[PDB]
Amino acid sequence: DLSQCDREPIHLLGGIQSHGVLLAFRGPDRLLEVVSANAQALLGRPPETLLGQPVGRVLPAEVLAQWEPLVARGSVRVVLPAGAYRALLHESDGLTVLELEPAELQPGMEETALEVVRRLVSPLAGVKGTQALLQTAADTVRALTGFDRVMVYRFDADWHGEVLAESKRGGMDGFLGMHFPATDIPVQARALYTRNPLRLIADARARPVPLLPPVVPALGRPLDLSNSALRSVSPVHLEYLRNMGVGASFSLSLLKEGVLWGLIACHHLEPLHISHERRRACEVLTQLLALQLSAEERAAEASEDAHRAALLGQLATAMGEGGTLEEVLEKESERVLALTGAAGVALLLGEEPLLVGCTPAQDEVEALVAWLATQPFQTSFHTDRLGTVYPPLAARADVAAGILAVRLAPAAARFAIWFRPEVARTISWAGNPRKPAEPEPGHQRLHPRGSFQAWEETVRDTSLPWKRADLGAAEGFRGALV
Amino acid sequence: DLSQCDREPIHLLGGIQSHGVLLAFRGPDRLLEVVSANAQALLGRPPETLLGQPVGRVLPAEVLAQWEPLVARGSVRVVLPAGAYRALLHESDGLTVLELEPAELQPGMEETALEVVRRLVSPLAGVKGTQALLQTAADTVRALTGFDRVMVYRFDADWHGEVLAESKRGGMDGFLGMHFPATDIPVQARALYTRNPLRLIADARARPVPLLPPVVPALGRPLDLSNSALRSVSPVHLEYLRNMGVGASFSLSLLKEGVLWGLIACHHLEPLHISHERRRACEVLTQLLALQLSAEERAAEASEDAHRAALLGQLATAMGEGGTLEEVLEKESERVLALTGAAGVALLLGEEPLLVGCTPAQDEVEALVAWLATQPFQTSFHTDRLGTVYPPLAARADVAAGILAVRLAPAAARFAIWFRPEVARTISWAGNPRKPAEPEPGHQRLHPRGSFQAWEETVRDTSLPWKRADLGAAEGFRGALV
Ligand SMILES: *C/C=C1/C(Cc2[nH]c(Cc3[nH]c(CC4=NC(=O)C(CC)=C4C)c(C)c3CCC(=O)O)c(CCC(=O)O)c2C)=NC(=O)[C@H]1C
Ligand SMILES: *C/C=C1/C(Cc2[nH]c(Cc3[nH]c(CC4=NC(=O)C(CC)=C4C)c(C)c3CCC(=O)O)c(CCC(=O)O)c2C)=NC(=O)[C@H]1C
């Protein structure tokens, strides 16, 4: 359901965090437009008094010698008097949208950047599992701008997610597993994160600094601050960090192969401005955690599912050295079930079902086969919820939560079914998940929580996943019968 | 092993590069021992002299201050009065080796490194090929190194290689798709190069500078320069360089899962010296693109299995729809001969066989299974020189030159089979391959072929190799047949 929580724009609010400068430009012969009410304190002359007038009479020679490499490169460092801000410029609704914002004072990005990477590459990064690859990234990021807590929120099936990492300092608090809503990182803001990686909260305590004039004439609405460098997050959100205990939040959204995945949150007690160069060079590492995952699952599967095929190679030679189904299936029944980490498996070979392992009762399975053949799957049908699809076997979960249809022939409702049982799973949650926001009596403008502390729910009457292998190994048996 | 090549003790041969200095520090109260002649270019007062003499008492105030940090971390910025060197160390052979050699002049090296780390990582990497993956790392290490010429070398099965890639400037002779031995980078140096990636040969033409006392006092044989940098090499190496038009060297070891997948050599038309932060920065780039293309191997594997399944999904419905095999194999005759990507199949499912593609005769089919029972193999026999191992039916250059066994029945003479033809594959041999290196009347000392010109080896009659996933679509077919 689209919510007042997800219908809400970003991109086109009010403007930029109180530490940049947006000086706009409309068409040919340069010429300023949408400015930034804070502009008369890093320039030299007030905003309203150069909102009509061209670049010649707005910027100093510095940035106007640099104007050419700017277009031509992306960003470009200029050391004009207040210090040495950035330059990052893109294209908007009809504009050249030049902004600067402070630059990096240490000459050990390059140096600390290159020792920090080596960690999250190495001669062989996967050694002691994937809680390391998650934990070294989360570490580095922390130990590459400095922070007092950072994790790896991962989204799942229903876009709700949890933190599989945690790097911290001498006795804060901090989350870990600890599920928290999907409403949070809403539909708006991972549709937008496919194209725009990271966001900087500079000083979550401090207030947003408007834009000039609040619309960009021609269009009618305000400016697309979407590709922005310093978009200011939103009331729904800082209302919702001033509880938590962040004066920051440093995110760099993952996506190895076009698909989102997680984030790396970075938290910090006191306002903190990491740079564009450092912001982007941890985007380089978020880009090295997404890759080295791609590589190992895309591997695991390869290395894991040989163990699968050595089952099916057992199950097939026995199958042809004394051809006799029931006899040869019994001895290699530990193998059948174990194809798929299963407890039970019926087979309909024409005659009566050969129930085999630790399955439910025959009178039951007969009703289960009619109900199947009167469903659509072109070959297979599985679920981790069971009672949800075919309620009759709800009550007797304990062996019946997840199944593998594998139609042996067309009209023939002969097949085999793999019963997979029931799993505990006491599952932690940051405040009661049943309610992830705060309606003000009319329900039109709302709030977050001030909650964030371990309300457990208990996933149960579900099972395990059915990961490409079960559903693939299993389709080996069905071609191995015909 | 064999000819004088896999003999040359290429770490105990004294000698060291002349820009560098490797001196050695023996015993407890850090106390000199072996110093590398030209050591008074950096200490005014002679090597000969202070082979006695405590550590700090032989080398400067400057460099003493920073004797502390390089124990802990082992790379310092000791900046002295002769363009300030820096010394990486390591403990070779029970004593401590300080390896004074030059700076990075230029403070981008790191900031530039980091940006070519991006070009070869940006999350659409390989979307004009693996080929394009190799030919980036070509132009990126090149930019790091200046070096006029970069290469990339895979060591195909028999240790002897190809140069997939290249990356030259203009009017630069080059081996684009050219092809040569693995005598060269021999037995010795593969074994050494698993242990350290890199090696430099900057001023090839520059003869070595002895390091006294020819042989390490209490051992004999020269110290052991194995895990040094500013060493030299088996002389008659930069030997077969003066036979080229190169006066430098840089070549890394791409290591992929711990086997040596080869190296990238950048050599220069005239001498050049790159740093040890700078060569760290390309050894870094090797253990990165390996991380990438390890995934790309794993990827097009899982994409090609999941392919073959879908192909076999169809196959086994033609199976279950009825008709006996011979009728089912009629059209799927087309589909099975595409299931190991071979020309035809032959059943032999008891009775007189099925020839059912572009097969040899009936009489030669049977001639194999006779012999195929004599020799080993539980389940399989994929060979490609099916005429070397087995001459009689070793003239089929057209119909069969690589066969595939499977036993449809354990201890029984029932094997189904897919033969596939000779394929002419033009090989642009670079120099003579009947001349790795012509010796001196004596056969006691070797210098190496002085002519690297294209040679034709048009190899009549083998198979396109037997790719894992292909190969792997056999244990199944055999299970889902009786
Ligand atoms: C329903 C509307 C609401 C909004 C709007 C809104 N939500 C977000 C996202 C968000 N929420 C979190 C919470 C959080 N604390 C942690 O420790 C972690 C990781 C472990 C998380 C995810 C985060 C981190 C985020 C976005 C990541 C970030 O802070 O950069 C946004 C994103 C701001 C944007 O526009 O980019 C917005 C606009 N917040 C609500 O509570 C509801 C009402
Ligand atoms: C029969 C004796 C022979 C030896 C002994 C030997 N040579 C080397 C050095 C070597 N060779 C290669 C191969 C190679 N890399 C390239 O780029 C090219 C041309 C494109 C070639 C042909 C390499 C990489 C090396 C290491 C240094 C270098 O090549 O730049 C060794 C080990 C090297 C060392 O001394 O440390 C040994 C033991 N080599 C022969 O070719 C024959 C004559």
Short mmCIF file of N, CA, C and O in Angstrom, two decimals, chain B residues 380-434:
data_model
loop_
_atom_site.label_atom_id
_atom_site.label_comp_id
_atom_site.label_asym_id
_atom_site.label_seq_id
_atom_site.Cartn_x
_atom_site.Cartn_y
_atom_site.Cartn_z
N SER B 380 33.27 -42.65 -17.66
CA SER B 380 33.68 -41.52 -18.55
C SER B 380 35.05 -41.79 -19.19
O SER B 380 35.89 -42.48 -18.58
N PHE B 381 35.26 -41.23 -20.37
CA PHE B 381 36.58 -41.15 -21.04
C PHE B 381 36.43 -40.09 -22.13
O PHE B 381 35.95 -40.42 -23.24
N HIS B 382 36.75 -38.84 -21.75
CA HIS B 382 36.85 -37.67 -22.67
C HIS B 382 38.31 -37.47 -23.00
O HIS B 382 39.06 -37.12 -22.09
N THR B 383 38.67 -37.81 -24.23
CA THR B 383 39.98 -37.50 -24.85
C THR B 383 39.71 -36.74 -26.14
O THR B 383 38.61 -36.89 -26.71
N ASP B 384 40.72 -36.02 -26.62
CA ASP B 384 40.58 -35.15 -27.80
C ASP B 384 41.59 -35.56 -28.88
O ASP B 384 41.36 -35.28 -30.06
N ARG B 385 42.67 -36.25 -28.53
CA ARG B 385 43.59 -36.80 -29.57
C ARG B 385 43.24 -38.28 -29.73
O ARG B 385 44.18 -39.11 -29.72
N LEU B 386 41.95 -38.54 -29.94
CA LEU B 386 41.33 -39.90 -29.91
C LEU B 386 42.04 -40.81 -30.91
O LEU B 386 41.70 -41.99 -30.95
N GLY B 387 43.03 -40.27 -31.63
CA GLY B 387 43.87 -40.98 -32.63
C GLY B 387 45.31 -41.18 -32.18
O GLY B 387 45.97 -42.11 -32.68
N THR B 388 45.81 -40.34 -31.27
CA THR B 388 47.15 -40.51 -30.64
C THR B 388 47.13 -41.74 -29.74
O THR B 388 47.97 -42.64 -29.92
N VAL B 389 46.19 -41.72 -28.79
CA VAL B 389 45.98 -42.73 -27.72
C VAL B 389 45.53 -44.06 -28.35
O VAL B 389 45.64 -45.09 -27.64
N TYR B 390 45.01 -44.00 -29.60
CA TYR B 390 44.17 -45.04 -30.25
C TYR B 390 44.19 -44.89 -31.77
O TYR B 390 43.19 -44.58 -32.41
N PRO B 391 45.32 -45.25 -32.42
CA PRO B 391 45.53 -44.95 -33.84
C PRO B 391 44.51 -45.51 -34.84
O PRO B 391 44.27 -44.85 -35.84
N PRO B 392 43.88 -46.70 -34.66
CA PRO B 392 43.21 -47.35 -35.78
C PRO B 392 42.19 -46.38 -36.38
O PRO B 392 42.33 -46.00 -37.51
N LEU B 393 41.22 -45.99 -35.57
CA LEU B 393 40.20 -44.97 -35.87
C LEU B 393 40.81 -43.62 -35.48
O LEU B 393 40.15 -42.86 -34.73
N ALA B 394 42.06 -43.39 -35.92
CA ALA B 394 42.86 -42.15 -35.80
C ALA B 394 43.18 -41.61 -37.19
O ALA B 394 44.36 -41.40 -37.51
N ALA B 395 42.15 -41.42 -38.01
CA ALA B 395 42.29 -40.73 -39.30
C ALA B 395 41.01 -39.96 -39.60
O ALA B 395 40.84 -39.62 -40.78
N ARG B 396 40.19 -39.67 -38.57
CA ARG B 396 38.82 -39.11 -38.71
C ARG B 396 38.75 -37.66 -38.22
O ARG B 396 37.68 -37.25 -37.73
N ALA B 397 39.85 -36.93 -38.34
CA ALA B 397 39.95 -35.67 -39.12
C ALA B 397 38.61 -35.14 -39.66
O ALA B 397 38.61 -33.96 -40.06
N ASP B 398 37.55 -35.95 -39.85
CA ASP B 398 36.25 -35.38 -40.29
C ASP B 398 35.12 -35.62 -39.29
O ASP B 398 34.40 -34.63 -39.06
N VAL B 399 34.90 -36.85 -38.80
CA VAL B 399 33.59 -37.28 -38.21
C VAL B 399 33.75 -37.37 -36.70
O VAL B 399 32.77 -37.09 -35.96
N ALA B 400 34.95 -37.70 -36.26
CA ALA B 400 35.30 -37.98 -34.85
C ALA B 400 36.77 -37.65 -34.67
O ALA B 400 37.54 -38.08 -35.50
N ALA B 401 37.13 -36.91 -33.63
CA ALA B 401 38.53 -36.74 -33.17
C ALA B 401 38.55 -36.48 -31.66
O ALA B 401 39.64 -36.22 -31.14
N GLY B 402 37.39 -36.61 -31.01
CA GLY B 402 37.22 -36.55 -29.55
C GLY B 402 35.91 -37.17 -29.14
O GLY B 402 34.88 -36.66 -29.58
N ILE B 403 35.97 -38.21 -28.31
CA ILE B 403 34.85 -39.13 -27.98
C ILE B 403 34.46 -38.91 -26.52
O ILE B 403 35.30 -38.35 -25.79
N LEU B 404 33.27 -39.38 -26.12
CA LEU B 404 32.74 -39.25 -24.74
C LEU B 404 32.06 -40.56 -24.30
O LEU B 404 31.03 -40.93 -24.87
N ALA B 405 32.62 -41.22 -23.29
CA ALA B 405 32.08 -42.45 -22.68
C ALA B 405 31.06 -42.08 -21.60
O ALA B 405 31.13 -40.97 -21.07
N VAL B 406 30.20 -43.05 -21.29
CA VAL B 406 29.28 -43.13 -20.11
C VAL B 406 28.79 -44.58 -20.08
O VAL B 406 28.53 -45.10 -21.19
N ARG B 407 28.69 -45.20 -18.89
CA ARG B 407 28.36 -46.64 -18.72
C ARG B 407 26.94 -46.77 -18.17
O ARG B 407 26.72 -46.38 -17.01
N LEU B 408 26.02 -47.33 -18.96
CA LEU B 408 24.56 -47.31 -18.70
C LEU B 408 24.13 -48.66 -18.12
O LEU B 408 23.20 -49.28 -18.65
N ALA B 409 24.74 -49.01 -16.99
CA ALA B 409 25.13 -50.37 -16.57
C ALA B 409 26.52 -50.27 -15.97
O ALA B 409 27.36 -49.58 -16.54
N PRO B 410 26.82 -50.94 -14.83
CA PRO B 410 28.11 -50.75 -14.16
C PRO B 410 29.13 -51.58 -14.94
O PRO B 410 29.43 -51.20 -16.05
N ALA B 411 29.58 -52.70 -14.36
CA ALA B 411 30.43 -53.72 -15.02
C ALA B 411 29.62 -54.36 -16.15
O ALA B 411 29.08 -55.48 -15.98
N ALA B 412 29.50 -53.65 -17.27
CA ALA B 412 28.85 -54.12 -18.52
C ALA B 412 29.33 -53.26 -19.69
O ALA B 412 29.64 -52.05 -19.49
N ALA B 413 29.37 -53.88 -20.87
CA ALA B 413 29.89 -53.29 -22.12
C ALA B 413 28.74 -52.58 -22.84
O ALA B 413 28.44 -52.98 -23.99
N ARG B 414 28.14 -51.58 -22.17
CA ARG B 414 27.04 -50.72 -22.69
C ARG B 414 27.40 -49.25 -22.45
O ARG B 414 27.07 -48.77 -21.34
N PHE B 415 28.01 -48.59 -23.44
CA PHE B 415 28.45 -47.16 -23.41
C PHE B 415 27.81 -46.37 -24.57
O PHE B 415 28.03 -46.77 -25.71
N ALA B 416 27.08 -45.29 -24.26
CA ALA B 416 26.53 -44.30 -25.23
C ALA B 416 27.56 -43.17 -25.48
O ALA B 416 28.33 -42.89 -24.56
N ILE B 417 27.56 -42.55 -26.67
CA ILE B 417 28.79 -41.88 -27.21
C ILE B 417 28.45 -40.76 -28.21
O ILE B 417 27.54 -40.98 -29.02
N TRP B 418 29.16 -39.61 -28.13
CA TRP B 418 29.06 -38.40 -29.00
C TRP B 418 30.45 -38.02 -29.55
O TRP B 418 31.14 -37.26 -28.85
N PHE B 419 30.83 -38.44 -30.76
CA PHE B 419 32.16 -38.09 -31.36
C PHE B 419 32.04 -36.71 -32.01
O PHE B 419 30.89 -36.33 -32.28
N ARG B 420 33.16 -35.98 -32.19
CA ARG B 420 33.18 -34.60 -32.77
C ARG B 420 34.53 -34.26 -33.42
O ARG B 420 35.59 -34.53 -32.88
N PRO B 421 34.53 -33.53 -34.55
CA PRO B 421 35.64 -33.55 -35.50
C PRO B 421 36.92 -32.75 -35.21
O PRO B 421 36.93 -31.87 -34.35
N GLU B 422 37.96 -33.09 -36.00
CA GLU B 422 39.16 -32.25 -36.27
C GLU B 422 38.68 -30.83 -36.51
O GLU B 422 37.64 -30.73 -37.18
N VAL B 423 39.43 -29.82 -36.04
CA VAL B 423 39.22 -28.39 -36.38
C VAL B 423 40.57 -27.64 -36.50
O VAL B 423 41.14 -27.23 -35.47
N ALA B 424 41.04 -27.49 -37.74
CA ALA B 424 42.11 -26.57 -38.17
C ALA B 424 42.10 -25.29 -37.33
O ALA B 424 41.15 -24.51 -37.47
N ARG B 425 43.16 -25.06 -36.54
CA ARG B 425 43.32 -23.85 -35.70
C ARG B 425 44.75 -23.27 -35.80
O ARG B 425 45.61 -23.65 -34.98
N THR B 426 44.93 -22.38 -36.80
CA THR B 426 46.06 -21.47 -37.16
C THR B 426 46.78 -20.86 -35.95
O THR B 426 46.15 -20.08 -35.23
N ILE B 427 48.08 -21.10 -35.79
CA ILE B 427 48.83 -20.67 -34.57
C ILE B 427 50.08 -19.90 -34.99
O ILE B 427 51.05 -20.53 -35.50
N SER B 428 50.05 -18.59 -34.75
CA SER B 428 51.02 -17.59 -35.26
C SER B 428 52.30 -17.64 -34.39
O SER B 428 52.58 -16.72 -33.63
N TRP B 429 53.06 -18.73 -34.50
CA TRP B 429 54.22 -19.00 -33.63
C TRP B 429 55.24 -17.86 -33.77
O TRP B 429 55.65 -17.59 -34.91
N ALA B 430 55.60 -17.20 -32.66
CA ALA B 430 56.48 -15.99 -32.62
C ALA B 430 57.96 -16.36 -32.38
O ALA B 430 58.40 -16.39 -31.20
N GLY B 431 58.70 -16.54 -33.48
CA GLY B 431 60.06 -17.12 -33.49
C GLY B 431 60.02 -18.59 -33.89
O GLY B 431 58.96 -19.06 -34.29
N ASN B 432 61.15 -19.29 -33.82
CA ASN B 432 61.18 -20.76 -34.07
C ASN B 432 60.82 -21.43 -32.74
O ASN B 432 61.31 -20.97 -31.71
N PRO B 433 59.89 -22.43 -32.72
CA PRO B 433 59.71 -23.34 -31.58
C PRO B 433 60.49 -24.66 -31.65
O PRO B 433 60.09 -25.60 -31.05
N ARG B 434 61.57 -24.69 -32.44
CA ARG B 434 62.52 -25.84 -32.62
C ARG B 434 63.92 -25.31 -32.26
O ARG B 434 64.94 -25.77 -32.80
#
